[PDB]
Amino acid sequence: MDLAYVCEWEKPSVPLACAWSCRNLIAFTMDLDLTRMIHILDTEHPWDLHSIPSEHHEAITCLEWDQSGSRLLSADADGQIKCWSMADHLANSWESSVGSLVEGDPIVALSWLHNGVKLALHVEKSGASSFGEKFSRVKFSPSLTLFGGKPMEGWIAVTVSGLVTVSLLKPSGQVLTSTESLCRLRGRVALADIAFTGGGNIVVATADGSSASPVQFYKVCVSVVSEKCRIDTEILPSLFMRCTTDLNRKDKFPAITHLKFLARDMSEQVLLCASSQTSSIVECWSLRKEILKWRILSATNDLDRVSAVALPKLPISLTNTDLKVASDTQFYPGLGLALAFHDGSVHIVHRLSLQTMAVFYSVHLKAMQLSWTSLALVGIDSHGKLSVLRLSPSMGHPLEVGLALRHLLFLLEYCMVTGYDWWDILLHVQPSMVQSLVEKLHEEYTRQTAALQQVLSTRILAMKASLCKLSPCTVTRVCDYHTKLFLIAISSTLKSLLRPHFLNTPDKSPGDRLTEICTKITDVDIDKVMINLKTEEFVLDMNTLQALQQLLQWVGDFVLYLLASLPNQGSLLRPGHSFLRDGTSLGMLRELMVVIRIWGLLKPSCLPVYTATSDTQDSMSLLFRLLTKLWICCRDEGPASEPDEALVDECCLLPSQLLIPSLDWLPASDGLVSRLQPKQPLRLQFGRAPTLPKIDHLRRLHLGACPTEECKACTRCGCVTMLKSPNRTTAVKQWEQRWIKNCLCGGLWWRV
Amino acid sequence: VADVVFVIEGTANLGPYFEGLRKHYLLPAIEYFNGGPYGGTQYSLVVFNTVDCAPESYVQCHAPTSSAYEFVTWLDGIKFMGGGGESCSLIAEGLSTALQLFDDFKKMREQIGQTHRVCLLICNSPPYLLPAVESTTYSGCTTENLVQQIGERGIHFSIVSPRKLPALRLLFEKAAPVSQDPRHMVLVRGLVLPV
Amino acid sequence: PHWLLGNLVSDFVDTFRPTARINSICGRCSLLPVVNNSGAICNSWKLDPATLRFPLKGLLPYDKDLFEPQTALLRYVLEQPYSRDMVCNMLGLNKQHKQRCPVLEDQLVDLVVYAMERSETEEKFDDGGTSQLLWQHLSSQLIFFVLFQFASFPHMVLSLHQKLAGRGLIKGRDHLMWVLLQFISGSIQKNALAD
Amino acid sequence: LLEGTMNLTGETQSLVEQLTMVKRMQHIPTPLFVLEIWKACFVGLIESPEGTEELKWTAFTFLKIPQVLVKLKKYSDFTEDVNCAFEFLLKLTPLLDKADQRCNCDCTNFLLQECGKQGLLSEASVNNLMAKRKADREHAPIQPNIQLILRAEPTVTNILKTSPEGLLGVLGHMLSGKSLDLLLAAAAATGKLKSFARKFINLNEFTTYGSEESTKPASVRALLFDISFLMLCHVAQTYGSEVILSESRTGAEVPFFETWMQTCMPEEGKILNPDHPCFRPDSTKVESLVALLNNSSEMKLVQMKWHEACLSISAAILEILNAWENGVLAFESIQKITDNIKGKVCSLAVCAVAWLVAHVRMLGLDEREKSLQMIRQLAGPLFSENTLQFYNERVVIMNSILERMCADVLQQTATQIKFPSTGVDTMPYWNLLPPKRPIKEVLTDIFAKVLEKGWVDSRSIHIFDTLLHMGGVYWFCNNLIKELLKETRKEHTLRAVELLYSIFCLDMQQVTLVLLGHILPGLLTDSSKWHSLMDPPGTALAKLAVWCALSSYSSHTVNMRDPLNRVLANLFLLISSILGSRTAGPHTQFVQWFMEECVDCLEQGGRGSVLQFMPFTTVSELVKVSAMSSPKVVLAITDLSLPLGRQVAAKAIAAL
Secondary structure, three states, X not given: OOEEEEEEOOOOOOOOOEEEOOOOOEEEOOOOOOOOOEEEEXXXXXXXXXXXXXXXXXXXXXXXXXXXXXXXXXXXXXXXXXXXXXXXXXXXXXEEEEEEOOOOOOOOOOEEOOOOOOOOEOOOOOOOOOHHHHEOXXXXXXXXXXXXXXXXXXXXXXXXXXXXXXXXXXXXXXXEOOEEEOOOOOOOOOEEEEEOOOOOOOOEEEEEOOEOOOOOOEEXXXXXXXXXXXXXXXXXXXXXXXXXXXXXXXXXXXXXXXXEEOOOOOOOEEEEEEEEOOEEEEEEEEEEEOOEEEEEEEEOOXXXXXXXXXXXXXXXXXXXXXXXXXXXXXXXXXXXXXXXXXXXXXXXXXXXXXXXXEOOOOOOEEEEOOOOOOOEOOEEEOOXXXXXXXXXXXXXXXXXXXXXXXXXXXXXXHHHHHOOOOHHHHHHOOOOOHHHHHHHHHHHHHOOOXXXXXXXXXXXXXXXXXXXOOOOOOOHXXXXXXHHHXXXXXXXXXXXXXXXXXXXXXXXXXXXHHHHHHHXXXXXXXXXXXXXXXXXXXXXXXXXXXHOXXXXXXXXXXXXXXXXXXXXXXXXXXXXXXXXXXXXXXXXXXXXXXXXXXXXXXXXXXXXXXXXXXOOOOHHHXXXXXXXXXXXXXXXXXXXXXXXXXXXXXXXXXXXXXOOOOOOOOOOOOOOOOOOOOOOOOEEEOOEOOOOOOOOOOOOOOOOOOOOOOXXXXXOOOXXXXXXXXXXXXXXXXXXXXXXXXXXXXXXXOEO | OOOEEEEEEOOOOHXXXXXXXXXXHHHHHHHOOOOOOXXXXXXXXXXXXXXXXXXXXXXXXXXXXXXXXXXXXXXXXXXXXXXXXXXXXXXXXXXXXXXXXXXXXXXXXXXXXXXXXXXXXXXXXXXXXXXXXXXXXOOOOOHHHHHHHHHHOOXXXXXXEOOOOHHHHHHHHOOOOOOOOOOOEEEOOOOOOOO | OOOOOOHHHHHHHOOOHHXXXXXXXXXXXXXXXXXXXXXXXXXXOOOOOOOOOOOOOOOOOOOHHHHOOXXXXXXXXXXXXXXXXXXXXXXXXXXXXXXXXXXXXXXXXXXXXXXXXXXXXXXXOOOOOOOHHHHHHHHHHHHHHHHHHHOOHHHHXXXXXXXXXXXXXXXXXXXXXXXXXXXXXXXXXXXXXXX | OHHHHOOOOOOHHHHHHHHHHHHXXXXXXXXXXXXXXXXXXXXXXXXXXXXXXXXXXXXXXHHHHHHHHHHHHHOOOHHHHHHHHHHHHHOOHHHHHHHHHHHOOOHHHHHHXXXXXXXXXXXXXXXXXXXXXXXXXXXXXXXXXXXXHHHHHHHHXXXXXXXXXXXXXXXXXXXXXXXXXXXXXXXXXXXXXXHHHHHHHHHHHHHOOOOOOOHHHHHHHHHHHHHHHHHHHHHXXXXXXXXXXXXXXXXXXXXXXXXXXXHOOOOOOOOOOOOOOXXXXXXXXXXXXXXXXXXXXXXXXXXXXXXXXHHHHHHHHHHXXXXXXXXXXXXXXXXXXXXXXXXXXXXXXXXXXXXXXXXXXXXXXXXXXXXXXXXXXXXXXXXXXXXXXXXXXXXXXXXXXXXXHHOOHHHOOOOOOOOOOOOOOOOOOOOOOOOOOOHHHHHHHHHHHHHHOOOOOOHHHHHHHHHHHOOOHHHHHHHHHHHHOOOOOHHHHHHHHHHHHHHOOOOHHHHHHXXXXXXXXXXXXXXXXXXXXXXXXXXXXXHHHHHHHHHHHHOOOOOOOOHHHHHHHHHHHHHHHHHOOOOOOHHHHHHHHHHHHHHHOOXXXXXXXXXXXXXXXOOHHHHHHOOOOOOOHHHHHOOOOOHHHHHHHHHHXXXX
16 A cells, blocks of 8 residues: 555654544544644645644543544543543534543543444445445444433443443533442453443453453443443453463563454454564454353464554454455455554454455554545554555455446445545545546436435535546536535525415425426516516515525526536636536526525615626526526427527627626635545645645635634535624524534534 | 423524524423423423434434423523535434334333323424434334324324424324414414413 | 742751641640530630631641641531530631631531441441431531521532532431421521522 | 562572662661661561461561671671660660560560571670660560571471471471461571472472382372472462472473472462463373262272372363263262362362362353352362371361462452461452552552651552552552652651652662653653652652662663663753753752762762763763852762763863
């Protein structure tokens, strides 16, 4: 794997920590007092890293990320398991809140309690047909499961001296903390890990000493009973014998440098990396019913000592039939175990044989965490660097391009269903097959069910755009998709404000009535006849109308622009394409034009103010005439004769009758991807943008030359919007509260 | 003497109107169950977001609280976060969790009182058309079937909505054993509110 | 001291300790009285009304123990019957005004917590078992202190809650509520309702 | 007190080295030195457990400290000095009278005569001091353990300096009761437990003979083997392992008991995987299997090897327990088998329950009833005839060993199997950490108690040890220096560091590494931890750091591969950067204080300000420009006896 990109800073050592989110946010401790600071990274925007003070007191030893993103847990070696949430929703402005404390050091992984949804990826046995059978739901249970059947949030944390801390998080917002000893014989737990056993979440807390002591697994249930947390422990089959203390090579591997359950939520498989000074040996173990007892599932030849172990995070079915077709189709991602060595190398492991799948002979990596699709790494280098290495779906094997297509399509569809993120998949998409991926996405979106297509009718556009940012043959299409997303948004927030009084007789919503009349019945070339054949009882209180002007002026300026671009003046494919030529977006715009006419007949203020050349021309009527002509030409399928000479004749006059405005376009930037290289790395700096490759896009409020007000910015969209909702107390709250979390693409906000 | 459960939308366009809809209807609801804000009335609350969430816990169930003031504290600070650019919030999974609550309340009661269960669906959006894929007790059960099973169990439910939406009238009529602002659609079952 | 000063000031304060020894009653912390109110008050057993520390003469560096709140002496004098006069002359309070002396509040709450703790330990299960003496006294003690306005029942119950919250348990809850009922019946006729 | 509690058998030379160092560093007048040594010995004796730790303190106090003081006399008017010390000591009637009470005899008459017997305390002084002690005795109104130890040392050493059943008579009179711990104590205190253990190990190696027919000599050899195995397994637990260990690695014999010591012998810090390649030889288990099973009567023992019998029992009990689990082997039958295996030499019971401890350690809670019900049986008494020549005492020593071994496992699930229960507490200083409570609370409570009273404790040293192992050296040093840095009064901070130096002597080397490297730079490079380094607590920490640095180096170009050397180099580099920096504050004062103390207690060991690196001596100029300190301390700093040293020291002193 090549470096995606690697960025250092400008410039004793303590253990580091990193945690890659469900979305793409990395949180690494980065011990350079800025030794105790948590760094947050956007991973599609390095060079802007937020340094949370973290207010801890000893080394931040365990970091961990909520299964939903949106929450970060950091425990020190003093005991403050502190929960970091997202201050008014913004990915670069974290805030400290409810946590807990026990003065011993939380040395074992802080775990985040398991919601019921586990996952399943039937990998290539069914990487052909549909979405339900590709990505299935396994029946794992929650921890405490609820009062009423939906999991309770919380965090287990085991400390040296073998305490446990459950600390449930009540929906009320206050913690219910508890503490109880693992085993009555208190003992040293130096390296330890937590994972969750499917049956009712009887979560198992493995805990070893340092050397030649058993690894001593345990069992801890959670027991909300009596309005106070309760935890009950029972020992489990202990496992001595890392299998290196019996080969009569006695002390060649004293210490245990790592023990990590092969996957959280996948207990009954543990990885044990013994080591020494310049030596290491890793072994997996499996708890088989024989009485339960552990026995080696795989062991590795002597190795240079391991510095960091990173586990796969993508759910993959280990069934024999599935691994068979994975070996055939070479869909390697899930079957990976990233071991990082002191010499400088990085090896991937088979996860069931612990052979070597790939190497990166290339200062070692002291903290390493895989991505959520097994396509990226994050190596906090010892000197202070940070690399994002690409792990190819097939470990460098050049197998045919259709197969790479099927691999990446399967992963992207997984990311569509789970909604996690797809920046990693974007790291690998070559510029050659972006068009083909988009075509296969079109297919696999049409084919599915006509029910799930609603779930994905907003993520499909985002993935289409993020793909089309590659492949310089199709950069023209990203602007139009991010405009179609905005058009859909406006249509769904203006067809939802109607609120009539009448419901005349039948089931016909005012938006449904809008659409049915506009499309089916009155394809009249002239407005004020569409206004006639409609109920004029769309009355919003005259305050929200006035607040709606900054948006309706968009739909106005966009109709004007789209109709202006018909003569195709530009030599290249312009930035209004594909909205011409057979779009239903023409129908949507016509609906919005009719409703704007009806609105403005009530309050003239909330109309699109066009700067006209002729004084009394009724500009809206002319634009509606042009739209109707274009939509009549583009409704029925087949005719490339839409630009009938009359229509282009009318359109080429439009600069003479109005002033073609200048719009933002909302890719608003070209992200780090589509810039990296095929192979070459990209040296970066923290706080200094790569030197070379003001519109408030969600309120359409012009910030001046300089902004003078703070503003967030979508990480993937490029959008920029004002942070404090600068409109008056009277402001449409169907918009500012729609984007207050994730923006229309679906990406987090970041402060400027 | 009964236990209620309210299924408010989490994030949809209800957020604006909810501040007024809470008084004129939701305050008389708590009143008809107490005079003027472990045994007896177990209030419950359930919020459900839209599909626009990279998994963020589709439904935030609260708890049963017997204190009418604890319920008004829940009902306040139901932060109406970002609903997507799409209509059609998922009342399906909300109704699924609601029935689970009722069921548990039933297995909790188990005693002499078989009290009338009231569940109110405050949503400005239409149904989502996709089955309850989040719940572990009820999966694949599309909202329609959920409404049938919530009607047969003998619990009467009232959909208040700040906007007159037909996709919800067909919902409410489809199960069976006054508006301060004329735009609202406020149709109640078993609860008496001042006309 | 300040970092520019240093061994000067610390070592000059350390040189007067051979004098603070000649002015400290050896074993002062552990010496306990015999509570007979006929010897109205001895200035030997007095305490600072606000910090519960033995009122020491001058400013010398004394032994570390003489700077710690004498909760032990106060608990002993508070336990014994007929001891309210020695307490009122000890903490220096005088029946002339409202006090809400917070230190007496805290120490009384601690006494009730200690009683709740002693309520366990096999308790002579179906009896008080010489632990009923503690509550028999605590009734009159709390009555005298709060009813004479030197204490505030609301804050006392509030702090008592936090003290027993996260503490072990019941097995002593009936006597506690019995103590409370005394003042309840005493002032639920005159004092305010929310108290 | 620490050298008495934790490490009794340690060589005299080590304690003499440690004690000279402290005297030098803190400039202890030689009269007060011996006063404190003798006071500590008595205090440890008085505050001691009842039965088998009391002999340890008395052996220590009466035999070993005298040889330490002899070696100290060698390493310096020392007679006049110990006389002054004893004059101080006699003028403490409370401590001496409590000693007289507990030891049951005049604890200072004896100590005086014993100190006089060596090269200490000339005879006239002895007579005078004994008269004075009797005079003190007069006013305040079954041989003791003191004289038993003072007689056990010479007699047992000289006669046991070097094969019929008469040897069995000797060993049986040795086991007669409270004579097994006397001999062991007297030997261990005098640096002789090695030779004793080796003598008995060679007796064990011989007695695995198995080349005789008749029953009378066979039984003799048999119970000789049993008693040898029990004696060695007792020396193994109580006086620590690794004293019986094979010193010379010849590589050929490695006698039996050494093998079995490493193979199972569960001792603190060893858990011993069962199913190890060594527990199950699988050569011939059927032999011991039929030997136990078929014969309802007592075993043949006519030619029993015992070389592989105690080894084969580990597999025998395994197979028997598996079969009993399955349901094939008839609970009454296994009752019979356990009766059989206890009925003769109890060494087999020890080895068997050793394997059973190893097994039950590695098993789940639900699957433990059978494995523990086997042990609860093997712990019981025979209650039968046809037993060897000494059964009662053999049973009591076996029960002690078994209790120590199984003490760990039967604490999870709590499995309370009781025991004969003589010698009121056989496990003193056992589980000592209040469960469900964190380690930091217990550490701060123990340390606050240790400040309320100068001397540490006997129990508190064990709590401190269990908290140093459980945890880390870093956690320990951090959460003790954090306590030192909160004390505001000078006397208390000085007492605190004086005590921390001894609480730290547990693993002094690693404590030095971690303290210096990770804690002092952390304090000196935070800009917010700087306020803690103020003057009353800061001078104390500086003294402690200098004492730690000197003690870690003085114990056992310069090899920069040694970690201590690297961390010292880093420490002095940071000293340099702080001295010559733009900002000055409490950090500069602390570094100057560290330098001043390193000059004060500078001795011949740390020649060059110990390990001032070669690019150093460049900040001697800075400790001159910021002198606050007399001249001529800077050549003490300076790397004297060096070519470049000449110039650097000269240019330096030219200024001050």
